[PDB]
Amino acid sequence: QLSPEQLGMIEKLVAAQQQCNRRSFSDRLRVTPWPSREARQQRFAHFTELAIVSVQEIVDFAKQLPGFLQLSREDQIALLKTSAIEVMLLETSRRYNPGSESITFLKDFSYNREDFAKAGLQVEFINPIFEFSRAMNELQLNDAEFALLIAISIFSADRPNVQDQLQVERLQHTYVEALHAYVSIHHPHDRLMFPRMLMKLVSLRTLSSVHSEQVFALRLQDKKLPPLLSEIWDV
């Protein structure tokens, strides 16, 4: 039963995400273009700068989340440091093209498993990103569902180093309840859709761990992350 307050909150999230997309347009325009050692470097720089812009959007989106700025700055950072990658994977799966099995990052440009490997990621991460994107596309989530899943991912009380676990959990649950009420209007004849969406949060945790192995492989290869990504992802 979707209440006025939930309906309004969901719409602001959806408006917030588009507003955040707008504020980082220019930054995505200045990113190193997709193209030897020079070409290889430029691809890695291309991907990683997309990730940086993306981290800036996630931060900006979080600040719009009701209750997020009332958490200590310490908890804000706690939450954003570990959910960033999960939010990035959710955004990746949003841009999945089933027919080509590619991800459309910049609008006239699709990226497939081969392009990912050329950008410097390993197959043990790429294949799971693409499998998740496939499974996610079958669900056919819309803006409202993607925005709520992103909120729920951010308000995860069980992240390392969260102090106000009670409050984070309390906040997460308002988004869970809103998602439930919302999915009952969008899918009124399928009570599995709500839980299926929450189970994607389960898959994302594993992908987060497979990502940690990817960050580790970059240490071995001495491919350094730029400063923002290194700060959030390096040990």
Partner: peptide
């Protein structure tokens, strides 16, 4: 603290 080790993230949050 996490804050002292996440300067760029901290600055993005401050604006």
């Amino acid at each position: 603290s996490l804050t002292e080790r996440h300067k760029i993230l901290h600055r993005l949050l401050q604006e």
